[PDB]
Design a protein around this ligand. Structure first.
Ligand SMILES: [Ca+2]
Ligand SMILES: [Ca+2]
Ligand SMILES: [Ca+2]
Lengths: 83, 349, 146
């Protein structure tokens, strides 16, 4: 659970299964976390930018992106895209 | 109408008059918007629209037209504006901790985002939201993009709330049976095929694929006979003492039902769709559908064992015109639930 | 009316007459204010207002109006001015210890500040003060804003 192929700061096993961000650290998903308001995330372990936007999976999941971006784009599968 | 703000907005617009493009103008210093947050406008809501009256790079040359175009304008013809492309910047962080937008072009990512994603649009009647959801390549073994269903993609993209088996965007139910779904040919083709191999026939259970185009339209009028009924009039001959409904109760049609839709309650020269859900365990009865509108059409519907959706289109002409009538009659015993009226695109006058 | 000064103030203004926007003018070299401290004005209190009479990038083209607009003006109608956006810079420090404002755009932070803050305005009748106060996100467990 320490392999990071794409060097996107999230382990491959964490991306294949669910994962969440606590204290700016990616941790494995437990179901009980959903009761505290945490969201389950999945992304590609071979792509640093799964959605193809200028922000990586860890940047979107952790919230290190510009605060004017909607929270929907915090999911790695939802791209930050202005229309 | 996206998810991220745009900095230094520089749109390009075509001015078209009677099949000819008068000019193609790119925004300059006088027309560049510094900030444009999602669900916002430049200029803001309380301000007047900005003036585009120059065509050169330094805002020093006006936009000319010739004599024939001026005569066409004086004859009643109108100029249309189209948007061809928009330029802008996104924000990043540098080694000094300051936000940098210069040199961060959104055009460097537009093609890549459109190539690997599927487009989902939501139209609640007053607002519009556009989203891109990533999906994997069909034939690539090395693509590790996770697979989610259409409903899961919608919930992820629009931050909808799941209170059980219900989906709410901002208090408006966006369930599969409460909204109108529009696709193109390819999306319709994949969606209908996939369903023919599923225990459920719910489109929201269909796996999302790259290249899909989905449009969700919240209905102008909707009734489920439980708590919501916002039709301009009251439905005639309604049976509410039932428990065989799609969600809570149904409307067992024993006779003829008619509605009166005043023309003032509908937009003129627009195409509307009347939709509903029907069920008949006997699978023997038939329903007659008739709508008095700009043109009156008559159709016959054969229900199935379980609930199925029926939809029929009609048009309107003129604000001060005749009233709108819709009638539904069944020879035997049928069930009706989730009756809705939705507004499609505007037919030209 | 804020809390921080602005350097190289470059406002953008709409000129509106009877429901039509005559022009949208961005400030140029002749109309840029070097310094604008909070609770102060450019030009200062004892000086005359600055003249905006050019619409091009090099302050060489005047702002024109047509015959109908001139007739409307001569009939008693008045032109209104609206502010759509203001550009400016903030000050930082470099490795040499000198204050640097070039390349420090206030527009890079306007949306972020407005997104995570609440607006409080105070009007004492003669003056106005506008403030932004940070507050946490309602649903985020990882937001630690007090
Ligand atoms: Ca990884
Ligand atoms: Ca990744
Ligand atoms: Ca019902």
């Amino acid at each position: 659970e320490d392999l990071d192929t794409d060097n996107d700061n999230i382990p491959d096993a964490y991306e294949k299964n669910g994962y969440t961000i606590k204290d700016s650290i990616a941790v494995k998903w437990n179901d009980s976390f959903a009761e505290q308001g945490y969201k389950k995330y999945v992304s590609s372990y071979l792509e640093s930018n799964t959605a193809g936007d200028p922000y990586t999976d860890y940047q979107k999941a952790s919230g290190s992106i510009d605060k004017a971006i909607k929270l929907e784009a915090r999911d790695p599968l939802v791209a930050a895209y202005p229309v | 109408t996206g998810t991220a703000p745009m900095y230094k907005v520089t749109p390009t617009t075509n001015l078209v008059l009677d099949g000819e493009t008068l000019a193609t103008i790119k925004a300059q210093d006088n027309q560049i918007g510094n900030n444009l947050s999602p669900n916002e406008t430049y200029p803001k809501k309380g301000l007047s629209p900005l003036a585009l009256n120059t065509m050169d790079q330094f805002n020093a040359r006006l936009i000319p037209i010739n004599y024939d175009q001026l005569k066409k304008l004086d004859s009643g013809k109108q100029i249309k504006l189209e948007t061809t492309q928009v330029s802008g910047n996104y924000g990043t962080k540098n080694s000094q901790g300051q936000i940098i937008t210069e040199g961060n072009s959104w055009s460097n990512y537009i093609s890549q985002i459109d190539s690997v994603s599927a487009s989902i649009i939501l139209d609640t009647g007053s607002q519009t939201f556009e989203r891109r959801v990533a999906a994997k390549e069909q034939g690539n073994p090395e693509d590790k993009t996770p697979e989610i269903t259409i409903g899961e993609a919608i919930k992820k993209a629009f931050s909808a709330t799941k209170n059980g088996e219900l989906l709410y965007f901002n208090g408006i139910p966006i369930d599969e049976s409460c909204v109108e779904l529009i696709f193109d040919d390819n999306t319709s083709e994949i969606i209908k095929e996939q369903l023919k191999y599923l225990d459920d026939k719910k489109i929201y259970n269909v796996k999302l694929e790259r290249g899909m185009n989905i449009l969700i339209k919240v209905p102008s009028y909707f009734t489920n006979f439980d708590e919501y009924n916002n039709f301009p009039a009251s439905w005639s001959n309604i049976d509410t003492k039932n428990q065989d409904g799609l969600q809570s109760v149904a409307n067992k049609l024993s006779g003829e039902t008619k509605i009166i839709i005043p023309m003032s309650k509908l937009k003129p020269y627009k195409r509307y769709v009347f939709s509903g859900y029907s069920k008949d365990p006997s699978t023997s009865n038939s329903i007659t559908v008739n709508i008095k509108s700009k043109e009156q059409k008559t159709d016959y519907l054969v229900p199935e064992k379980d609930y199925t959706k029926f939809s029929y289109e009609f048009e309107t002409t003129g604000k001060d015109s005749s009233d709108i009538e819709i009638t539904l009659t069944s020879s035997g015993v049928i069930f009706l639930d989730n009756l809705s009226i939705t507004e499609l695109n505007s037919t030209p006058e």
